[PDB]
Amino acid sequence: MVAAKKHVPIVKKRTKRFMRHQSDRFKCLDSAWRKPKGIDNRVRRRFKGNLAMPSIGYGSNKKTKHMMPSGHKAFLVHNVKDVELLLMHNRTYAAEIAHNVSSRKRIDIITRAKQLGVKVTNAKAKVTTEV
Amino acid sequence: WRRVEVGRVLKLENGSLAAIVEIIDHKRVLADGPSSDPKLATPRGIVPLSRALLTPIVIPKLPRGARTGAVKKAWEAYGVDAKWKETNWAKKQLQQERRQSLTDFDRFKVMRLKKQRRFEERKALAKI
């Protein structure tokens, strides 16, 4: 037995993203959400068949917020001292090695995390197995 | 064919018979159903003509307005139950009531016995 904690089932109220209105038509408009401010904008007036806007009713359960599908929460690590901070939180948190960590430091983090019982999300990074 | 008249017994919908006591309107009749068979009995009351089928049995001399005792006496005098038993509608009804009462084993025995009879009719037809 080594997994995440016992947690209530993870329910996502909405899996799709909220796209900005008319952002699929214009290349100058990024898909990041912007609240429409026009008076006659039917997205803002919430007419039928239009885009929904983000609301606080779409929020996630506080017991499963920030939680991965495995049940752990992501903990960004830059060195070995950072994974050592998860000695007492091995079942609640998983190690996420930072993108600018070198290969040997990544090997050090992965080795220590395995001994501590901490899962690593990106353990298939720039390393390989030698026999 | 058939005409509505005092003494005309008619089958309703539920496998029951009711003799016309008096004609109320072009669409409704007063009818009374005095019998001994619980399935063929009918309470005295207004019977719409749309929900009734005329039966070729006639009570010969029914006084109009006859109450339940007189209609029962005429019913037993003619033998309306036996003539309903012999006509085609009740033979079809009994065939249907027996048909819906087969179980799975009864259906298997029906198909097997039909196969034996069928082989015998094939022999009889091959004679011809």
């Binding site: - | 064919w1 509505v4 008249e5 004609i23 109320i24 007063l30």
Partner: protein
């Protein structure tokens, strides 16, 4: 109007020191339930004897069941219908087994032929034509004639509305 019932509504003024022991006015009202019977009784006593619901009370509300509902009889009903032009008095015959059934048919007939409402009809009186020949409506006299007997031609067979397709064309001799 639905399952109408004949209600015997007795009602009287409120008793006062100056005027004790009122007159106990009684009326027969055909209504679906008791609340309509009481309301129509007051609507009529507001009209006739000038007593009010606030200054009056209901003595009794009794169901008047038909004595012989298994015997077909002739009813003659007098009625006053307020039309667009004005109020008119009529009188109509009905062959029913109960006074309630006659009033129900009356309401259906005056709704179909004259487009009359429930609130626009005042049933003056409902009587039974015990003696033959009292009926004056020709249709009713046809039914009261000697030794009536008529066939039922072209009888549409009651087929199931969920039986969509039939293999055999049906017959209308039943």
């Amino acid at each position: 109007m639905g399952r109408l019932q004949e209600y015997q509504v007795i009602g009287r003024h409120l008793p006062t020191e100056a005027n004790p022991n009122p007159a106990l006015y009684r009326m027969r009202i055909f209504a679906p339930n008791e609340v309509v019977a009481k309301s129509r009784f007051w609507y009529f006593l507001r009209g006739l004897k000038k007593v009010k619901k606030a200054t009056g009370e209901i003595v009794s509300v009794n169901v008047i069941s038909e004595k012989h509902p298994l015997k077909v009889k002739n009813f003659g009903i007098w009625l006053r219908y307020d039309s667009r032009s004005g109020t008119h008095n009529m009188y109509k015959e009905y062959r029913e087994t109960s006074r309630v059934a006659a009033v129900e048919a009356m309401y259906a007939d005056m709704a179909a032929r004259h487009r009359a409402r429930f609130r626009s009809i005042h049933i003056l009186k409902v009587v039974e034509l015990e003696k033959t020949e009292d009926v004056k409506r020709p249709y009713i006299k046809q039914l009261v004639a000697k030794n009536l007997s008529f066939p039922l031609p072209h009888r549409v067979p009651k087929i199931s509305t969920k039986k969509i397709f039939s293999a055999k064309r049906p017959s209308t001799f039943s």
